[PDB]
Amino acid sequence: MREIVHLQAGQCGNQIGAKFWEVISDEHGIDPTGTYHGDSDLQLERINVYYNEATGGKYVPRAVLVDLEPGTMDSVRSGPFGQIFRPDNFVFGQSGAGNNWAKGHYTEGAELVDSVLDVVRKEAESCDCLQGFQLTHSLGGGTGSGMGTLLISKIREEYPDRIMNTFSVVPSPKVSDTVVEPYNATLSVHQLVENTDETYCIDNEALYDICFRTLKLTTPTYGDLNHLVSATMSGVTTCLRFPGQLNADLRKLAVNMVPFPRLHFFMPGFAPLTSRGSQQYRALTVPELTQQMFDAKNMMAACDPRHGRYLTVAAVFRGRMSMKEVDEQMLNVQNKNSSYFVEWIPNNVKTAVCDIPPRGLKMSATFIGNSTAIQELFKRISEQFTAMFRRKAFLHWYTGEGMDEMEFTEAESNMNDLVSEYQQYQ
Amino acid sequence: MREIVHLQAGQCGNQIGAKFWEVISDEHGIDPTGTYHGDSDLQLERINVYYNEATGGKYVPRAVLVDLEPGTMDSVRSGPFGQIFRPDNFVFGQSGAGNNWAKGHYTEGAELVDSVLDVVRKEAESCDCLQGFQLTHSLGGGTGSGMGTLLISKIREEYPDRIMNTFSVVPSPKVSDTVVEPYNATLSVHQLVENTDETYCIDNEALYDICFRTLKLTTPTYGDLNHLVSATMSGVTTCLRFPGQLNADLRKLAVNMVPFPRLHFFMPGFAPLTSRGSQQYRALTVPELTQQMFDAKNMMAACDPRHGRYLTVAAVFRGRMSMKEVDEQMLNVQNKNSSYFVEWIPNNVKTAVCDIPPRGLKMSATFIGNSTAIQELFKRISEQFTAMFRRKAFLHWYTGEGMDEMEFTEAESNMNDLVSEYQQYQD
Amino acid sequence: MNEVKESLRSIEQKYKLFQQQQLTFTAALEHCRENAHDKIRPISSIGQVQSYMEHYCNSSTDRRVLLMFLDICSELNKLCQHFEAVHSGTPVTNNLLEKCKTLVSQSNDLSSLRAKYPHDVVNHLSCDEARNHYGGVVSLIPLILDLMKEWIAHSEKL
Amino acid sequence: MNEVKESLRSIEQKYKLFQQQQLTFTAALEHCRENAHDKIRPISSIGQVQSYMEHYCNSSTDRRVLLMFLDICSELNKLCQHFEAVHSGTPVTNNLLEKCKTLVSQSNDLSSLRAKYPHDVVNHLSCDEARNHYGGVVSLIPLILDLMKEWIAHSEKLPR
Amino acid sequence: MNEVKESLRSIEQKYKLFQQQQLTFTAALEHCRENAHDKIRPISSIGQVQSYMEHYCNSSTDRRVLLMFLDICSELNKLCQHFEAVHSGTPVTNNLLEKCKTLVSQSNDLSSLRAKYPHDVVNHLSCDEARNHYGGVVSLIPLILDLMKEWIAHSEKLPR
Amino acid sequence: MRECISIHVGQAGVQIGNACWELYCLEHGIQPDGQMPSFNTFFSETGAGKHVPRAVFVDLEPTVIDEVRTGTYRQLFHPEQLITGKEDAANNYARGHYTIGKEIIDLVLDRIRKLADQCTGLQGFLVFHSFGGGTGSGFTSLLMERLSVDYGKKSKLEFSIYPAPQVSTAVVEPYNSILTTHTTLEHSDCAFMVDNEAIYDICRRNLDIERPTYTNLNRLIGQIVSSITASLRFDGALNVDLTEFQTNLVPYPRIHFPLATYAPVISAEKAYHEQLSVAEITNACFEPANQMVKCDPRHGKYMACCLLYRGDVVPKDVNAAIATIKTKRTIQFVDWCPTGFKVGINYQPPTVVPGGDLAKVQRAVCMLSNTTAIAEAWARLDHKFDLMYAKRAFVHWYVGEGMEEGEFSEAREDMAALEKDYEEVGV
Numbered sequence A: 001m002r003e004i005v006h007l008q009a010g011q012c013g014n015q016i017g018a019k020f021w022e023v024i025s026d027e028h029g030i031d032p033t034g035t036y037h038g039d040s041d042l043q044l045e046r047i048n049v050y051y052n053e054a055t056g057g058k059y060v061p062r063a064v065l066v067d068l069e070p071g072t073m074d075s076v077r078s079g080p081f082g083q084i085f086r087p088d089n090f091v092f093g094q095s096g097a098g099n100n101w102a103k104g105h106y107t108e109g110a111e112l113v114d115s116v117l118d119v120v121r122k123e124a125e126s127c128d129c130l131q132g133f134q135l136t137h138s139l140g141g142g143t144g145s146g147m148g149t150l151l152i153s154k155i156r157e158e159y160p161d162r163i164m165n166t167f168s169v170v171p172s173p174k175v176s177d178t179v180v181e182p183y184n185a186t187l188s189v190h191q192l193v194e195n196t197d198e199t200y201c202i203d204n205e206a207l208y209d210i211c212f213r214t215l216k217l218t219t220p221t222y223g224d225l226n227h228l229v230s231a232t233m234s235g236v237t238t239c240l241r242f243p244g245q246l247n248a249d250l251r252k253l254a255v256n257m258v259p260f261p262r263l264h265f266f267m268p269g270f271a272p273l274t275s276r277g278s279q280q281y282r283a284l285t286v287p288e289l290t291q292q293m294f295d296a297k298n299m300m301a302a303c304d305p306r307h308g309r310y311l312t313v314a315a316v317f318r319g320r321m322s323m324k325e326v327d328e329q330m331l332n333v334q335n336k337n338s339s340y341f342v343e344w345i346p347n348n349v350k351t352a353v354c355d356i357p358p359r360g361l362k363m364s365a366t367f368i369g370n371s372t373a374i375q376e377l378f379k380r381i382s383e384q385f386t387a388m389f390r391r392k393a394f395l396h397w398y399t400g401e402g403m404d405e406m407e408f409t410e411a412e413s414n415m416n417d418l419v420s421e422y423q424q425y426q
Numbered sequence B: 001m002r003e004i005v006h007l008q009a010g011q012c013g014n015q016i017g018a019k020f021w022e023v024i025s026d027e028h029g030i031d032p033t034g035t036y037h038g039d040s041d042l043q044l045e046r047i048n049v050y051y052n053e054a055t056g057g058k059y060v061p062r063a064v065l066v067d068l069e070p071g072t073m074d075s076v077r078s079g080p081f082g083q084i085f086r087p088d089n090f091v092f093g094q095s096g097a098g099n100n101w102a103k104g105h106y107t108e109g110a111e112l113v114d115s116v117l118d119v120v121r122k123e124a125e126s127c128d129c130l131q132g133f134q135l136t137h138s139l140g141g142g143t144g145s146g147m148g149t150l151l152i153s154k155i156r157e158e159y160p161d162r163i164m165n166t167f168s169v170v171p172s173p174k175v176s177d178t179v180v181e182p183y184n185a186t187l188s189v190h191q192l193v194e195n196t197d198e199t200y201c202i203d204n205e206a207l208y209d210i211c212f213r214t215l216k217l218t219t220p221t222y223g224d225l226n227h228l229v230s231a232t233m234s235g236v237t238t239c240l241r242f243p244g245q246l247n248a249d250l251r252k253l254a255v256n257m258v259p260f261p262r263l264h265f266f267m268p269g270f271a272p273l274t275s276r277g278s279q280q281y282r283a284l285t286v287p288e289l290t291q292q293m294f295d296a297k298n299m300m301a302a303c304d305p306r307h308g309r310y311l312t313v314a315a316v317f318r319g320r321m322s323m324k325e326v327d328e329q330m331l332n333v334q335n336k337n338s339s340y341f342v343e344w345i346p347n348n349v350k351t352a353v354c355d356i357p358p359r360g361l362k363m364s365a366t367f368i369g370n371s372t373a374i375q376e377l378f379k380r381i382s383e384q385f386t387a388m389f390r391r392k393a394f395l396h397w398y399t400g401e402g403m404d405e406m407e408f409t410e411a412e413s414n415m416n417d418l419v420s421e422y423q424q425y426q427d
Numbered sequence C: 001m002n003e004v005k006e007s008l009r010s011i012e013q014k015y016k017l018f019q020q021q022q023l024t025f026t027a028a029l030e031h032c033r034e035n036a037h038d039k040i041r042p043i044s045s046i047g048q049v050q051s052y053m054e055h056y057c058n059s060s061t062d063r064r065v066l067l068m069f070l071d072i073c074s075e076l077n078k079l080c081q082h083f084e085a086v087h088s089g090t091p092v093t094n095n096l097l098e099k100c101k102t103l104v105s106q107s108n109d110l111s112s113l114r115a116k117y118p119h120d121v122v123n124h125l126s127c128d129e130a131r132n133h134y135g136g137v138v139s140l141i142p143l144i145l146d147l148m149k150e151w152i153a154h155s156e157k158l
Numbered sequence D, E: 001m002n003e004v005k006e007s008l009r010s011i012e013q014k015y016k017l018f019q020q021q022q023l024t025f026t027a028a029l030e031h032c033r034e035n036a037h038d039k040i041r042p043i044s045s046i047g048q049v050q051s052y053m054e055h056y057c058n059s060s061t062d063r064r065v066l067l068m069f070l071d072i073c074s075e076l077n078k079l080c081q082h083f084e085a086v087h088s089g090t091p092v093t094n095n096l097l098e099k100c101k102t103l104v105s106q107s108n109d110l111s112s113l114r115a116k117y118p119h120d121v122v123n124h125l126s127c128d129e130a131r132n133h134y135g136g137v138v139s140l141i142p143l144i145l146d147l148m149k150e151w152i153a154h155s156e157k158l159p160r
Numbered sequence F: 001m002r003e004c005i006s007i008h009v010g011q012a013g014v015q016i017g018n019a020c021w022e023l024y025c026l027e028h029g030i031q032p033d034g035q036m037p038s039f040n041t042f043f044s045e046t047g048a049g050k051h052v053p054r055a056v057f058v059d060l061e062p063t064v065i066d067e068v069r070t071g072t073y074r075q076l077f078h079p080e081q082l083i084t085g086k087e088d089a090a091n092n093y094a095r096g097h098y099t100i101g102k103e104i105i106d107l108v109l110d111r112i113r114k115l116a117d118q119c120t121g122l123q124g125f126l127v128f129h130s131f132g133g134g135t136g137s138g139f140t141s142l143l144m145e146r147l148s149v150d151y152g153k154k155s156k157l158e159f160s161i162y163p164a165p166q167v168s169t170a171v172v173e174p175y176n177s178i179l180t181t182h183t184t185l186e187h188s189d190c191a192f193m194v195d196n197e198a199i200y201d202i203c204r205r206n207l208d209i210e211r212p213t214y215t216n217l218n219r220l221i222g223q224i225v226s227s228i229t230a231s232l233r234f235d236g237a238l239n240v241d242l243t244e245f246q247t248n249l250v251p252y253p254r255i256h257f258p259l260a261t262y263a264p265v266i267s268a269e270k271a272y273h274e275q276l277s278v279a280e281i282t283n284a285c286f287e288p289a290n291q292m293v294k295c296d297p298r299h300g301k302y303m304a305c306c307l308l309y310r311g312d313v314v315p316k317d318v319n320a321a322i323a324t325i326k327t328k329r330t331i332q333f334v335d336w337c338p339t340g341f342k343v344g345i346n347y348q349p350p351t352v353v354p355g356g357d358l359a360k361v362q363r364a365v366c367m368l369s370n371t372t373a374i375a376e377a378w379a380r381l382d383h384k385f386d387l388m389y390a391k392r393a394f395v396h397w398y399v400g401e402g403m404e405e406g407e408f409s410e411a412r413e414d415m416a417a418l419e420k421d422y423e424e425v426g427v
């Protein structure tokens, strides 16, 4: 009865969001054609959260896909599950923004978003109690970044009392894929702080590290990294759609991990990843998972807890399991790993357990973290942006489009004052 | 019983009316020969609403098709339903009016209409009590307009206590098809206000958008564009021929809809529209249809609703559904869109239900509405007619044909006073 | 068995179409009676219906309705033959086959035929004119359909 | 004997899948009854359910549930025939096989059938729906399964 | 029996034609009797009709109407020749065939035939002419056609 | 030996009347033909066994009547009792009072006199019509003007489709309602009222039906009438006559506008868990969520309450519950009607239609109650009627069809006088 509209913008967001809808179909048993073939009534019980209803048994995804370059959406609709989405939600512009944030904010995408407002309005008014918008994008690509951060700012003015969950891949030091991505970082996170509630900072180097170290897979292309990514967004709503022993919706999590509006940047994780030679040698238990969640290796960020302190941590379980060992093992690591948590927040861990497991795995776990290792990630962004603006370089694509340099210095003030305030509580 | 004869004129009218009967013969299930082969007795019951009974199990359509240029009616008898119409019902003139209002009214007007009036009065008095008239003429073609307006003028006089409903084609700027559209439409709409009860205005340009935007039609010839015009007109009189849970007719529509005798210009919308690639991709329900109803993309005229207020809104629904849903979802649209309707008329929306849906469809939705934004459909013709008259453009035809220039200024001034009438109730 | 079920489904669909087009059949019977001027003589035979269709029917829709009734009778006769082709013998099955053949014969006195629930064709029509002539023609189809259903149930039991 | 036991195990797995999709079967029956407007006359035959699926089923999942139910009934009938095809049969076994044939008969009225413990198929439906609407159609699986298991036990109890 | 059925409509149509030309036929037999001087003999013999046509015919109209009547007789004879071979036989059917052949034979008197209520051809004439003069000839056609409808009813009744 | 005559006007009187006599033949055990496999109270009989109902149905637009002519209950009714009109009145009171109302009134008056001659003893008239209707507001008004001239002191009742405040199926409905509350003010002895927006809210929360149509509205409204006039139909411990409850509910010749409220509006699954005590059937009657008309009692004061029960009800807890009903201070009463409760008990319990969306109940309750909560319900409708006359909308049809424009000014004064009567009574 609660619904989420899944906005999906940018080529990275389109490719990540393509796998997102692929797994929740796989957990519910939906073919690429669109004929329902779920073998259980449990997903029939709660399906209206993400799918909508068409006449004849067609369950249509509630996905809006918008991008300024038409090349992705052809490959999206030519994908394995691209034959099911809404063509009227597909609104493609012609000119790609060219990794420029000001292109997505004044020049070409600024006209397109008015059409985007009508499309999301069409999906919104069909419901009665909507949670909010799960938008998948990326900070690196200015087409997803320039248009996307204008969308959060516009929806927030329109809809004050909802939830705004954003899954964005933050810029990375070693997999720097765009020269102006530090500019695309600072001009975008400046909108991510003020008017966004749930923000999930995914860093691809750990995703690169996980497939290298933990999985040791020989040929995992983008069809395989996105599979690990796509599981985590389900764990955000794994208690929303699957009823069980202990239930928690979105804002139950959102209020709980966020003490102040400046602290809302979430490191995600998934937890039953296992090396292919070691299924039979590994015993499937809750204490086996206890090392695995609070392993530093399995996080989706190139960050170290060694560097920062946990404030709030959320780890939702998934499977048929007791409540003893869930509390007892968390009693163990809250004891031993006391230095990682701050001394002034007790009962750091929120544990919620869902009974329904994913297909092909008897048990699952999903990680959310709110540490103070994200301050150095944003600090490294700040100093590189400080060095670039010191030379005032690359600005002719920016200043030549009418936007002024006063927006650069305010974000530079706003970037440091985000993480300077992180220090006071550290 | 109560009865409407259908009237066609001009090249534009005869192409619409040929396509207009392509759907109402389908809804009643009639072969091109003229013999019923439907699968429902309810079709046979009120089948005399448009037809005349004939021996041998035949049914002859009753329409008066008139054209001074005989090129069009040959294509009418070359149409798919050319062998079903009455051969005595076709009246042909010698020379066409040639996109002139002056040639269609006074010079080459009287020599055909009295031969036409031998056909109409024979058919009209043949019934017991006639219900009204339904004419398709266009304001851009001289043969359709001036000859048609003269048909409007005198059949009104012959039967004074009777309703007349017209489906007229208003022009658009980007689809400019006649040089004297600021002349011919001005010379037509001035006599329609005084002497027509109901006027329905259709514009070509938005239909070229609708086949692209709504249905995503790839090769939209006039067979496609007239079809959306054709099926829209059928839903206006659907309760006349089929039962309904809330029956209504044209003059039911009129009473609820028209505040004053001189403000009777409407806008139609047809809306169960869904593209071919989305047939499995949409749900058929009243939350979809009401949202599809008042959308700006689905009005059949080059207008915008936000530049005015809807005075009254009527709707003839059709299909099997739940009476609460229309009674609900026409209510909150009066609530949420509070400024988009007037405040001096309470309960603006008018609703009606017919039983039988069309073949190939589950539920259907039809819109008829008067809005105060319609004055741009009149002041544009007013400012263009001033642009014509200021440099004395094209006046040389009308001077030698007997038309006084004071007739233009009388037509200019009274239609200039009328645009304030839509304007004054806005403010 | 399966082919008998297919023919039964086809006969049921055609009979549902006839029930939808039932009023046109009444109009056809009225026009045939008016043309033949046999108001005293009630319509009680399939041969009478065929003769009225061939001689006292002029409307195309009336002829189509009479052709539908004749096709229903032909389908009943063919299904009766196919039942004998498919089955060997039983007491109830033999009695039902004899009754079906007698009812499907063109000389069957239909005036004694009165259908039961859920065949509400009598309630839909007027039983004054039906009890005069139309009731046997209205109720011949439904009792035959019920007998066919009973024979199908007996064949399933066997 | 061995193939009959394998067929019974496959039927048990199929009935477990049907119980996992049991609410889909109830929704399919409700949709078929609403489409056919037979809200007063209850569905009393597997052939009647098949006809409703043939004429008044439009939802793909509903059609899949009805097809699974009809195929499970067909497998039960094939096992009933295979019991006589395999074993000679005792007198009580002949009575049980006649009961199996009568229960799996498509023209038989199943409105009088109600399950008992430990089969909670009746408790899986509402009291009115079990009493007058779909109790027999819901509970046909358990009594037929118990009859098949009793026939297998009787065939095992026969001497050599 | 499609040829038989087409013959049935043709014979019915020519029977309607004969009954439409009933009044001229009586005057035809009247002047035939006047020319033959056999006023005592009641006209009920087919061979007598043959001889009267062949000898005492003086007008083309009478020649034509006697042609029509004897053509009716001959085509009914051919229909009886098909009916005697088309059926297998019950005692009732044998009685029907024997009566049909006995009536259509020219060697039999037909003075004992008077029509029933469905055919009103008896009452259209004058008193003595309908009673004793031409009653057998007038009632020959309804008896044969009534045997035709009775044979249709019996053949539709009998299960083969 | 006693008889009752039910007159239904308009198609709003048709769908209600199609269900009203649907339950009546279902109660007594009557086949749709009119023969069985107390019946003389409403139905008449033929010596051959058939039954002819003593009822008249009137409409002007036949395609809703045409459902009856070939319906399931086609043979139940009488051929010449169901008078077929020619052309609809179409929401115009001036249509149904000067031109249409004057044609078939004398044919209506002739059939009643033919029925009154059959009536060796008649109790009164149950009139069914709609305020927003065209036929039900025009043709009723001059019928009641003519029925009161012909008959001196016979009993007269009314069941009206009162205008709900929010939902609407018409636009000039306030003009028809104002022109109905003038003529019926002068002569109608009583006026029971229902509105649709109450029923949609009732059909949602109580019957647990997501999608109701007027057939579901017909079955609930139709069973209200059955329990109203079951006392004359079936014997009981304390019967109520039609002459009785028109006198026990009307305080003044002008204040004659009661309400209704039914209990238990309860579904099949819901009543299997909710007990039906004598207390709980009548405690739900005074709960505002079950109120059959959208108005609240918190601004209202009750004037009179006629209650009718059916079935296995013991008369002990009838008084014990009403005693408990009188205990709460939240229920308001005026200080000049302390002993203002009526009790009617009937032996025969109500029956359920095949496939009934209600519950098959052992006991039942109806309340026909006047109150001062209805004054707020016209405290909006009077402002609606004064709003449009200020801009003089929709007048121009009313002038030409026969009524005076001054009748708008005169009937406004009667509208305020009735409201002024409600204020002084409700102090």
Ligand SMILES: Nc1nc2c(ncn2[C@@H]2O[C@H](COP(=O)(O)OP(=O)(O)OP(=O)(O)O)[C@@H](O)[C@H]2O)c(=O)[nH]1
Binding pocket: B246, B247, F009, F010, F011, F012, F013, F015, F016, F060, F061, F088, F089, F090, F091, F130, F132, F133, F134, F135, F136, F137, F161, F169, F195, F196, F214, F215, F217, F218
């Ligand atoms: N509650 C309810 N209201 C009905 C029903 N049928 C019709 N109505 C009401 O009838 C009103 C419409 O007016 P009509 O009944 O069509 O008007 P009329 O008196 O028949 O006159 P004409 O329109 O000329 O035929 C609407 O307000 C409907 O709510 C019904 O079955 N239930």
Ligand SMILES: Nc1nc2c(ncn2[C@@H]2O[C@H](COP(=O)(O)OP(=O)(O)O)[C@@H](O)[C@H]2O)c(=O)[nH]1
Binding pocket: A009, A010, A011, A012, A013, A015, A016, A099, A138, A140, A141, A142, A143, A144, A145, A169, A176, A177, A178, A204, A222, A223, A225, A226, A229
């Ligand atoms: N995790 C993940 N990242 C991707 C994928 N495809 C592209 N990216 C990242 O997307 C970033 C560039 O963003 P871009 O696609 O240009 O966004 P756009 O400008 O809106 O199209 C690069 O840094 C890539 O690392 C993918 O399949 N998975």
Ligand SMILES: Nc1nc2c(ncn2[C@@H]2O[C@H](COP(=O)(O)OP(=O)(O)O)[C@@H](O)[C@H]2O)c(=O)[nH]1
Binding pocket: B009, B010, B011, B012, B013, B015, B016, B098, B099, B138, B140, B141, B142, B143, B144, B145, B169, B177, B178, B204, B222, B225, B226, B229
């Ligand atoms: N929608 C539509 N418009 C048409 C059709 N045929 C003609 N027209 C319009 O009619 C106008 C010209 O009409 P015209 O032939 O000059 O009328 P006439 O001279 O009086 O016969 C053009 O603007 C066309 O857009 C048609 O089939 N459909």
Ligand SMILES: [Mg+2]
Binding pocket: B247, F010, F011, F012, F133, F134, F135
């Ligand atoms: Mg009406």
